[PDB]
Amino acid sequence: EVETFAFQAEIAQLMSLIINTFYSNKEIFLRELISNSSDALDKIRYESLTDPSKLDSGKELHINLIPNKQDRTLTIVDTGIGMTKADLINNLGTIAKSGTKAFMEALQAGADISMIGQFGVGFYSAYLVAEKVTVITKHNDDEQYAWESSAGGSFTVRTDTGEPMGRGTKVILHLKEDQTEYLEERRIKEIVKKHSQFIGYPITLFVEK
Ligand SMILES: OCc1ccccc1OC1CCOCC1
């Protein structure tokens, strides 16, 4: 059973600006997703400080980068707090409406797209390199759900029947045809070292056969 939702008009405008603006520094998408993962890991760690049972769904707190050249997907996995269904529908746990409004006023006032993370809507930078984004998430207080959007003003939410995650979030980037460089090991390592050297969680870059 698949539910189709319309993006709020401001979020649809943010997504089309990310997709249509000529802007060569696309690699910052990975810094933004890793930083989101770090924030999600910070949240579950803080909750575990007064309730250790919050980690019954998984004691390890990490970030995995899984490239797959056959599927042409880059997957960012974290074992953070995850998102409920309401969180997914409500712009994936962000205040995206007010964040987009501030971001667009900054762009007309000199800012560039690399600054998107300062306005709390860094997730949507995924559409700099992805034609379609799938978000699989599991929160302790809800079931596993799958969020998906190819932009175009709508997204879908369904119960995920795939591989159980325990707890955390999985961002699957179905990359554009001309953006497969972000599946190469040395390019991913370069970006992680350049923009994510101070992330307080182990970032493991998977290799392929
Ligand atoms: O796993 C991190 C993540 C993945 C996809 C979308 C958003 C997102 O980050 C939100 C803010 C941090 O915590 C709540 C979720």
Swiss-Prot record:
PTM: ISGylated. S-nitrosylated; negatively regulates the ATPase activity and the activation of eNOS by HSP90AA1.
Effect of substituting residue 78 to A: Impaired ATP-binding. Strong interaction with HIF1A, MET, KEAP1 and RHOBTB2. Loss of interaction with HSF1 and ERBB2. Los of interaction with TSC1
Coiled coil: none
Entry superkingdom: Eukaryota
Cleavable signal peptide: none
Residue positions where N6-acetyllysine is found in the record: 43, 69
Residues at which ATP binds: 36, 78, 97, 123
Localization per record: Nucleus; Cytoplasm; Melanosome; Cell membrane
Region (Interaction with NR3C1): 1-209
Record's comment describing the protein's domains: The TPR repeat-binding motif mediates interaction with TPR repeat-containing proteins like the co-chaperone STUB1.
Described function: Molecular chaperone that promotes the maturation, structural maintenance and proper regulation of specific target proteins involved for instance in cell cycle control and signal transduction. Undergoes a functional cycle that is linked to its ATPase activity which is essential for its chaperone activity. This cycle probably induces conformational changes in the client proteins, thereby causing their activation. Interacts dynamically with various co-chaperones that modulate its substrate recognition, ATPase cycle and chaperone function.
Subunit structure: Homodimer. Identified in NR3C1/GCR steroid receptor-chaperone complexes formed at least by NR3C1, HSP90AA1 and a variety of proteins containing TPR repeats such as FKBP4, FKBP5, PPID, PPP5C or STIP1. Forms a complex containing HSP90AA1, TSC1 and TSC2; TSC1 is required to recruit TCS2 to the complex. The closed form interacts (via the middle domain and TPR repeat-binding motif) with co-chaperone TSC1 (via C-terminus). Interacts with TOM34. Interacts with TERT; the interaction, together with PTGES3, is required for correct assembly and stabilization of the TERT holoenzyme complex. (Microbial infection) Interacts with herpes simplex virus 1 protein US11; this interaction inhibits TBK1-induced interferon production.
Annotated family: Belongs to the heat shock protein 90 family.
UniProt-recorded name of the protein: Heat shock protein HSP 90-alpha
Source organism of the structure: Homo sapiens
